[PDB]
Symmetry: C2
Subunit: 55 residues, 2 copies
């Protein structure tokens, strides 16, 4: 009885974290890419202002 | 009279040729630096040109 009830409470905590990992693997990697593309892009924006005057 | 004359003749050629390299040294290396920042201007502009699509 107590073994079965506890396996089931432990099951609820594994399940819920399996949903947390699934969104964490999406959002941490999506934010990473978007931060990198965003910060690369500004360096060209600012760059070209100056280097087109240098052209 | 041979030695002295033709040494004056040899001295003039040295004079001509040093006089060419003083003007020449500055231009060629300026040209080299021209071609350096040219390729940079050309690289930031290709990357600046699609910046709107990325944004």
């Amino acid at each position: 009885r107590t073994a079965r009830a506890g396996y089931r409470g432990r099951a609820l905590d594994y399940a819920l974290q399996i949903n947390v990992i699934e969104d964490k693997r999406k959002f941490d990697i999506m934010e990473f890419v978007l931060r990198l593309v965003e910060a690369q892009a500004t360096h060209f924006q600012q760059g070209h202002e100056e280097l087109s005057r240098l052209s």
